[PDB]
Design a binder for this molecule. Structure first.
Ligand SMILES: [Mg+2]
Ligand SMILES: [Mg+2]
Ligand SMILES: [Mg+2]
Ligand SMILES: [Mg+2]
Ligand SMILES: [Mg+2]
Ligand SMILES: [Mg+2]
Ligand SMILES: [Mg+2]
Ligand SMILES: [Mg+2]
Ligand SMILES: [Mg+2]
Ligand SMILES: [Zn+2]
Lengths: 157, 208, 105
RNA sequence: GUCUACGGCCAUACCACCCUGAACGCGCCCGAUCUCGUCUGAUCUCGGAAGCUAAGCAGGGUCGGGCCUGGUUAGUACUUGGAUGGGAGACCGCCUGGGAAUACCGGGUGCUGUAGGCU
RNA sequence: GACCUGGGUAUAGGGGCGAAAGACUAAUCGAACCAUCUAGUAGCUGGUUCCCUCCGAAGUUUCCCUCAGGAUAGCUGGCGCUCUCGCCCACGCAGUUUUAUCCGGUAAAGCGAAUGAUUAGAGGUCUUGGGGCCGAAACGAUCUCAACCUAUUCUCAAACUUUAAAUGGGUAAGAAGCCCGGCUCGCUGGCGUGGAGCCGGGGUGGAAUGCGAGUGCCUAGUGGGCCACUUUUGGUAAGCAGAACUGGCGCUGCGGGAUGAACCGAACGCCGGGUUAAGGCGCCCGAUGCCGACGCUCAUCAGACCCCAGAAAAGGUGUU
RNA sequence: GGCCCGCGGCGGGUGUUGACGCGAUGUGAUUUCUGCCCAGUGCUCUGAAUGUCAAAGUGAAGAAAUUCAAUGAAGCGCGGGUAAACGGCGGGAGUAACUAUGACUCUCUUAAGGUAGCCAAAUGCCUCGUCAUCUAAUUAGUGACGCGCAUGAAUGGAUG
RNA sequence: UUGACUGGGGCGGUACACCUGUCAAACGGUAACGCAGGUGUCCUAAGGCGAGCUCAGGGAGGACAGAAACCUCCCGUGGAGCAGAAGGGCAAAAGCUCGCUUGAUCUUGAUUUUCAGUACGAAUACAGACCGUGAAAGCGGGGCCUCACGAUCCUUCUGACCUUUUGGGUUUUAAGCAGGAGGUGUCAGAAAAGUUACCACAGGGAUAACUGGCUUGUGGCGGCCAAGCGUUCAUAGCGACGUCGCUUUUUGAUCCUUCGAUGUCGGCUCUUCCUAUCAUUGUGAAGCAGAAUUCGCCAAGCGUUGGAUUGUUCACCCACU
RNA sequence: GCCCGGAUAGCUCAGUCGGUAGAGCAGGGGAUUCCGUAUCCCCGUGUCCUUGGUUCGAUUCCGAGUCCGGGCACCA
RNA sequence: UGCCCGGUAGCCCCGAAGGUAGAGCAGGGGAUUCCGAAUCCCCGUGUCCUUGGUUCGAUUCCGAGUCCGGGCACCA
RNA sequence: UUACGGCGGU
């Protein structure tokens, strides 16, 4: 029916976006991937040698293996009724650093040190984050003028 | 040719004449402007549109009978070369025919059911103009009656709307003469070429 | 497909790259007294007729041509096999083509 | 205040035309005996240092064209969920939450890394 | 008379006999009858015997001479087991939101942006294609259609696209985390470099809400599905064929839709009192037998309540 | 000996028979004709003319199993015959002094290209063919016609 | 013994193994005998590396020379090429030309894709040899990527100074071990012609041939608009180009009911119903003088025949009315 | 009432190599012969079916309409 | 699956084994005849299905590698 | 051995 081919539904997603064709920027290769670095997968279209599949494009995994030109990444794949820890070799052009934990890594760094500021100063700063609370009972001011009377416009085509 | 009840309401995704179709006959409309096409902008100030009320398909063949019905009427009172009729929507949607019994069950059943091209229709949206004529301001009542006779050849519902613009342009007719006068608009035939104040200054020296 | 008369490849008997003679392989004489021929000749004997399937519904028109690589350096004399993706027309030493012809069909 | 060598981000850096360029540099340049390469010392390679900022290059300019950024367009077009809503239908309005795109208008026009020299 | 018949006689089952019809062969013949092998085989029909309690499906994946069937995974039940809460913090998890951070090319929009279609005029001129003349003849001299270009303008695209939503998808939101000290390496290599590993030490309150989890074995039934929102393919359409998401029916009674598989409420142990939902309240038929409010409408075919069971264009000095 | 039966026998049937016989087919009285094709399929016949072709036997190599070579029965292949054997009997080009047609000429396929007769027949789709006749009226009937989907010569043709 | 799929089966086709764009509803997945196509190859270079170069096109020039030869300059973001079907990719390049080469070699595992999370096939990242190229970094273990292929059993060849050939030795032979090939296109892989009107059995409304039901293309019957027809004059009567419905007396589409059976064409016979009215009753309008006709209205009360041909419904003809 | 090739002078017909519209019958005019037959030669006659597209080039290629003939034909 | 044969001018066919490419047909011309018809002669017409190989050059001579047409064998 | 034709009227 449906031609179960590798690289099948990627008429658009294995393409360079627009006016970013040509040869690749070189700081793509001067990235440092250690074990446990959380990386996400976005397969390009210029390098043919190590593009993953159309199931990992847009997903995020974690580096378990580092070699000369590629990186082993352990991702989760939704197959029918269970998800599977799967491990793929992907060349280094197709990935980047996930910034999803990098806004967690600030608030473990500036949270551990602000904890020990309350031990020298003596308070209960409550360093845990809260959601957006309901708005405070504030006070609006119509100083000078009076409010504007608006009304719905008539219908004209 | 089947009735237009069969080929009405926009059901299929649009299927135009391309290298994938390759078997489509010609549309019965081939000319689209039929008044005095050569006129300038100030020669016909007002215009009057007919505007669709519903989202349907008008056939290429119905647009033929409508513009003949309006060009015939407006040479009778407004006279030959005293108007400029323009039919605005163009037929690009190719309808298909499942031409069976080509009295027998013998050809197929519904087996190979994708049909052959049979005509062209124009998909029209709610609020989209179909025809548009422009005349003198003295001939305003003949605009409505020409569009009134034309709407009996269309399915569905259409309303006739006397516009707020200057002819077939996009600028309002109240301040058109106020603003073509000094510099901002130049007339090029039956249209208006808006000039901004942001080009090279050399063409501003070419103006004045 | 044109693959030449000589070829420098790896031979396992010494463990080097060194040249070879490459020729087309043929299937060889189907010998009697093999185990599945000694079995087939006693099963097919007697009454009963044809006793194992004779295949007739042939579909492929080519064969994977294989080459025998004979190691050329003396006192080795060690052969092997190597395959190529299948082809219809198989030349061995036929005049390496130049890219400046005047083809003229 | 700039340049050279090597770079990063890859048009706010491009393209067309036009003005200016102290000093070091980069170039144009002047030559084929060797190295080398050609139909051709044009290119490439090699020896120079009489000239010249003419060009490239660098700065600036253009109611410039692109590009970048923001207004309008527009709470519009679409859309999540909802109704024993409307309508013969096609479609529409409301409730609940999100929410664009062009024309049109304006503002911008390379930023910096390491090493070295002029000023 | 190639006549009709009695009795005797011969021909016996893949055989007989036939002026031929596959006729006849003991009411049996396109292969007799009788007994046996034999309770022959059947992916196909029909049937399959007491009660109560508790849990509770599937019509989909892949392979098969597979398509009326099986093997396989899913869904199911039974058996447990490992533990957690019993009495300034849950080990953990989630068909959820938030906080960030990625991903995507559909709706829309766009084509005075590329590809592909497409209408109209304007302006300009190298020209040829063709006309108009000064004329033996002279790219000596003067116009028109076209073509070409330039700036605009009308209309589009499942297999076009700069731009680009809503819904959606992934990850992260701590003790397996953070920091420090040292030492192994045959890997890497200007370098007490780099990276892994190992040992030791230091500080636990790290979004909202809800909830007890983890784990193994054995395993039946199922493998024809059907309907409705919304999204969509073929078709003129279909109570038509085929998908997507969710809910239902099948397996499910009850109240309302007169009637009913699927609509609207709502899910069920056996009762008493109270209240409601959807829907109603002339009389069948419980409830307006309210001194209900405001209008619209007269039909010689009135109208009358989701799905749902009857109507369009057009028209009316009928009334509002 | 031919044609047959038969598990078996030189056992039986035709056969107490002998070519005016027995056995096997086809067509179907009489009268009258039975045209053309041996390529195909059969059948048949012949010469160490000859390709392919099994065992057994012959020769070689070998320790032997074995291997190899040579030689060559019928059959098929090759050549002839045969259609009262099964069957087949289409096209295409030129060509007559009106057009039309083709007595004539020449080709292909594959051997030959439907002769004499007969027909909308129990065989003709179109078709209720056309014309005549019969009836007031005829998809009927009969008689004619004849590039006859797809007539035709012991598949017997036409008669009577 | 006589494949399967199949809007019944047959004929056809391959939707039976595989690839591209779409469908597909912005992760992935997703159907139809849905759309547009392709595949059973080809290549010692079209593989590998390195170097140099720039393409399609257009302009302006140059003996013949012209739309098309070659030479030169300029512009030229890919508008060309990359074997081929498409899509993606590519510019001191993955293209074009040249110079060396065989990494299209040897070997163990891991992983991805299809997926049951099995296999083949294809692919990816390594690791260990041995090589090629380049000044070198590097790149290379086939084709720029997405397709281009195949189990067990058997055969055959190759490999080690290998194991077993049964009481022990020697030698042929035979069997093993490891991996290439000889295939199963119905492509997870049986060894395969019909016919049955003489037929039979087990079934199936999962499945055709009737009626019915939904639908109404097609048939039939109407409405609207009105350029023209009608001497004049759109509308007495018509009416093109359109366009909106109705009906289920036609034909189809469908496959819901019926296969442990609903007796299947036509004629005869007889009854009742419908109106979309041929006649008759009462009317209105004409391009209605009369007569004869036509178009409408209330209207189904009452009538709507006799025959030749044909099984015919239908058709056609004679005659009455 | 579905499909395959054709639309061309008075007719009829081939070729319309992507570059002309040319055989031939009918008429015209000659020549021929004592005169005619036949003959032989020359002249006439092409929207190359209609429109749109593809190059100093299309009747010719590509496919739209119209027309003309020639045809796929199940069990029930 | 190996054995056994055959491959040409524009179409059939001669040989041919070590020494040249030849009967007929068709085309184009002559000649013959008072003239046609028949007839006779001449031209033009050839990598022999294509890659090699000793001798002495070479389609052959030679058997090989190749493609068209035909042989009797049969285990995935 | 092969040798077939010769427009009409004058
Ligand atoms: Mg030199
Ligand atoms: Mg030199
Ligand atoms: Mg120089
Ligand atoms: Mg300078
Ligand atoms: Mg300067
Ligand atoms: Mg500047
Ligand atoms: Mg600007
Ligand atoms: Mg919604
Ligand atoms: Mg609801
Ligand atoms: Zn060796």
């Amino acid at each position: 029916t449906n031609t179960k081919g590798k690289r099948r539904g990627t008429r658009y997603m294995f393409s360079r976006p627009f006016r970013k064709h040509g040869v690749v920027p070189l700081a793509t290769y001067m990235r440092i991937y250690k074990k446990g670095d959380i990386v996400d997968i976005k397969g390009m279209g210029t390098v043919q040698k190590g593009m993953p599949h159309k199931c990992y494009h847009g997903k995020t995994g974690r580096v378990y293996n580092v070699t000369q030109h590629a990186v082993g990444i352990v991702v989760n794949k939704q197959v029918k009724g269970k998800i599977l820890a799967k491990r793929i070799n992907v060349r280094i052009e197709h990935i980047k650093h996930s910034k999803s934990r990098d806004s967690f890594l600030k608030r473990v760094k500036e949270n551990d040190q602000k904890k020990k500021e309350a031990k020298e100063k003596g308070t209960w700063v409550q360093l845990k984050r809260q959601p957006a609370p309901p708005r405070e009972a504030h006070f609006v001011r119509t100083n000078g003028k009076e409010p504007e009377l608006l009304e719905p416009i008539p219908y004209e085509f | 040719r089947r009735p237009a009840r069969c080929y009405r309401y926009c059901k299929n995704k649009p299927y135009p004449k391309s290298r994938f179709c390759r078997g489509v006959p010609d549309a019965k409309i081939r000319i689209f402007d039929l008044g005095r096409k050569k006129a300038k902008v100030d020669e016909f100030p007002l215009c009057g549109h007919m505007v669709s009320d519903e989202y349907e398909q008008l056939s290429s063949e119905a647009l033929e009978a409508a513009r003949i019905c309006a060009n015939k009427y407006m040479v009778k009172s407004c006279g030959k070369d005293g108007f400029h009729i323009r039919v605005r929507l163009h037929p690009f949607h190719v309808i298909r025919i499942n031409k069976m019994l080509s009295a027998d069950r013998l050809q197929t059943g519904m087996r190979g059911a994708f049909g052959k091209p049979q005509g062209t229709v124009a998909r029209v949206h709610i609020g989209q103009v179909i025809m548009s004529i422009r005349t003198k301001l003295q001939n305003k009542e003949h605009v409505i009656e020409a569009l009134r006779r034309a709407k009996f050849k269309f399915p569905g519902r259409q309303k006739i709307h006397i516009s707020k613009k200057w002819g077939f342009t996009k600028f309002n007719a109240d301040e058109f003469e106020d603003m073509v006068a000094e510099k901002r608009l130049i007339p090029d035939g039956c249209g208006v070429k808006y000039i901004p104040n942001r080009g090279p200054l050399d063409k501003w020296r070419a103006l004045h | 497909v044109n693959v030449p008369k000589t070829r420098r490849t790896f031979c396992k008997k010494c463990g080097k790259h060194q040249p070879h003679k490459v020729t087309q392989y043929k299937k060889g004489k189907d010998s009697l007294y093999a185990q599945g021929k000694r079995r087939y000749d006693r099963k097919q004997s007697g009454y009963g007729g044809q006793t194992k399937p004779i295949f007739r519904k042939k579909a492929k028109t080519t064969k994977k041509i294989v080459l025998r690589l004979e190691c050329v350096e003396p006192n080795c004399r060690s052969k092997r096999m190597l395959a190529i993706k299948r082809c219809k027309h198989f030349e061995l030493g036929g005049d390496k083509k130049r890219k400046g012809q005047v083809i003229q069909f």
